[PDB]
Amino acid sequence: TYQYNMNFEKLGKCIIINNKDKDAEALFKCFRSLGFDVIVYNDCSCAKMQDLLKKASEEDHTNAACFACILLSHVTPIKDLTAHFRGDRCKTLLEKPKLFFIQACPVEADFLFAYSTVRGSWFVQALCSILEEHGKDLEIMQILTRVNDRVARHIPCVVSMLTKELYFSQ
Amino acid sequence: TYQYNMNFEKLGKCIIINNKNFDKVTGMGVRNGTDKDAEALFKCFRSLGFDVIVYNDCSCAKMQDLLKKASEEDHTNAACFACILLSHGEENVIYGKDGVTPIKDLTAHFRGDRCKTLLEKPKLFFIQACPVEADFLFAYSPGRGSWFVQALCSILEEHGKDLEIMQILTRVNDRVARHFIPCVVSMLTKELYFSQ
């Protein structure tokens, strides 16, 4: 009970929003490099992100272990996107984590965040360089705090409303 | 190394601000059980090498003037630094006996440029309210104490010397959610266990 369960078919479905391309392409490879069902979206007319998310919120993740999403900007409210995956709002994701990665320029338990700001950026450049190398053998926090170390060698916060540790088995 | 340096003379300070009785003009309830909430934390961090100092029913000017004077100290022989708040709070703001000060104003005193004595050192902050900002961590959260506090030390005197803070805080988040949620915002750069 000290880590999140991983006896699941799919790892999870990864969503990538890309308003505007190196970071996206690099995030794609490195997240599929964990075993993610990755889907990329560009030129997202702000009406998209809403319906785009809610769809996935009404999908089935019973045979999925988790769920990740990534935003890339430079107009859509933060909370109005995440609330689709509330406690009751998406019952297929309970006792399952929700991971939102951001870079621009009961309920609410088991959520994680990471917002960065500005070739491509550092944060991104830094992250993949870990997930490729130490991706499948670290707890999530052990990873992000390593990224903050890497970017500081040249800062993005990290909201953790999680309940157990997070490595990446099957 | 992939973790914070603990080989220091002393650990660090541990300012506790126990706000219980606020003024009437604030129209703010008397936060009860907070004496227990403080004593629990004080006893806990005491047993972790924190030189614990407990402040009580302070004004906003006090809480401001206090931390500033503590930021301007010599923290060189100290590994880290902690500060725990107990009061009423709202949207990124926290009550004093007299008024209301923005939380980001209190912590600002320690921002690496204005507290060089704590640079590359973790500067912690615990909130229970009813390399700019690097090395910062924030953990915002009856008869017995609160859940959070009681559950924290419950895990902290038990595992605190042998677990990383996230391992500690993530653990805390489970037992509070077990009863029925706190948000741990981290800007750290290295893992942090509470021993040598």
Side-chain angles (χ1 to χ4, degrees), chain A residues 1-73 75-78 80-85 87-88 90 92-94 97-107 109-114 116-118 120-135 137-145 147-149 151-163 165-166 168-170, chain B residues 1-23 25-35 37-61 63-67 70-90 92-96 98-103 105-110 112-115 117-132 134-139 141-143 145-149 151-156 158-160 162-177 179 181-189 191-195:
Chain A
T1 180
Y2 290 156
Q3 80 168 19
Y4 278 88
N5 182 27
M6 282 307 188
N7 180 255
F8 286 88
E9 300 187 1
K10 29 192 286 190
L11 214 190
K13 181 179 167 183
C14 186
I15 305 181
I16 304 184
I17 307 307
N18 183 24
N19 307 334
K20 182 155 170 293
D21 267 46
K22 169 193 152 167
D23 308 47
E25 177 189 4
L27 278 176
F28 181 79
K29 172 188 163 191
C30 103
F31 272 77
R32 181 63 205 134
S33 165
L34 296 203
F36 258 113
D37 301 342
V38 203
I39 308 182
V40 192
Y41 297 111
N42 306 42
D43 294 8
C44 291
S45 50
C46 304
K48 261 298 179 60
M49 318 174 192
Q50 282 297 328
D51 174 75
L52 205 47
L53 260 58
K54 178 201 59 64
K55 279 204 167 192
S57 182
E58 293 153 352
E59 291 183 355
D60 174 33
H61 312 287
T62 304
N63 291 0
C66 64
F67 162 76
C69 173
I70 307 171
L71 315 183
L72 297 172
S73 296
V75 43
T76 297
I78 320 295
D80 284 312
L81 299 162
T82 111
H84 293 186
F85 314 90
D88 43 338
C90 187
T92 347
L93 300 182
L94 285 187
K98 303 90 178 176
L99 268 53
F100 305 138
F101 304 157
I102 298 171
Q103 174 164 287
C105 304
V107 178
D110 309 27
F111 281 85
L112 186 142
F113 298 87
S116 191
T117 44
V118 174
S121 84
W122 271 298
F123 171 72
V124 183
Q125 208 166 318
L127 173 65
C128 310
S129 187
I130 310 307
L131 309 184
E132 218 81 22
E133 174 71 299
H134 289 104
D137 48 312
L138 288 187
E139 199 265 66
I140 179 69
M141 291 307 304
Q142 281 185 357
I143 311 175
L144 312 184
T145 28
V147 164
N148 295 270
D149 184 30
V151 58
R153 290 176 183 168
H154 301 101
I155 185 170
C157 58
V158 165
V159 197
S160 174
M161 287 118 51
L162 287 172
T163 56
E165 303 188 37
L166 180 67
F168 285 104
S169 172
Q170 303 295 83
Chain B
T1 200
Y2 273 147
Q3 41 197 292
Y4 276 114
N5 192 22
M6 304 311 293
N7 204 274
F8 279 76
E9 181 183 325
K10 39 175 52 181
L11 220 204
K13 266 187 172 190
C14 185
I15 314 193
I16 303 180
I17 306 186
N18 190 73
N19 279 322
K20 184 186 178 180
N21 320 329
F22 307 95
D23 299 340
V25 296
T26 67
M28 290 306 302
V30 197
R31 229 170 30 90
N32 286 323
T34 200
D35 298 297
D37 273 334
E39 179 79 5
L41 295 172
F42 142 72
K43 281 195 168 190
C44 189
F45 290 54
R46 195 245 307 269
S47 78
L48 297 190
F50 283 103
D51 287 308
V52 189
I53 328 288
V54 166
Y55 293 80
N56 306 281
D57 299 26
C58 337
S59 66
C60 285
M63 302 184 309
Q64 265 295 337
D65 174 34
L66 167 59
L67 307 184
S71 70
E72 297 168 18
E73 291 193 6
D74 179 28
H75 299 265
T76 304
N77 42 7
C80 70
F81 159 72
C83 180
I84 299 178
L85 303 192
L86 290 170
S87 179
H88 289 114
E90 297 180 351
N92 64 271
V93 94
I94 184 171
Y95 285 170
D98 55 0
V100 201
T101 42
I103 296 178
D105 283 25
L106 298 182
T107 92
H109 301 326
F110 300 86
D113 63 281
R114 25 191 170 270
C115 187
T117 353
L118 271 168
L119 256 179
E120 303 197 35
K121 306 185 173 192
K123 340 181 199 304
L124 272 54
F125 280 106
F126 295 77
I127 301 182
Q128 181 163 265
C130 333
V132 193
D135 313 325
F136 271 93
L137 182 134
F138 298 77
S141 169
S146 73
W147 293 355
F148 177 80
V149 173
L152 164 60
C153 305
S154 173
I155 288 303
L156 204 49
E158 177 187 14
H159 280 104
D162 35 279
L163 283 190
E164 214 272 3
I165 340 114
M166 303 316 299
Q167 292 166 348
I168 302 284
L169 298 199
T170 307
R171 266 178 180 262
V172 175
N173 288 14
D174 191 15
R175 39 180 45 252
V176 46
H179 290 70
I181 272 297
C183 28
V184 180
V185 177
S186 185
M187 283 99 57
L188 292 196
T189 38
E191 304 183 35
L192 173 59
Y193 299 82
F194 268 177
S195 30

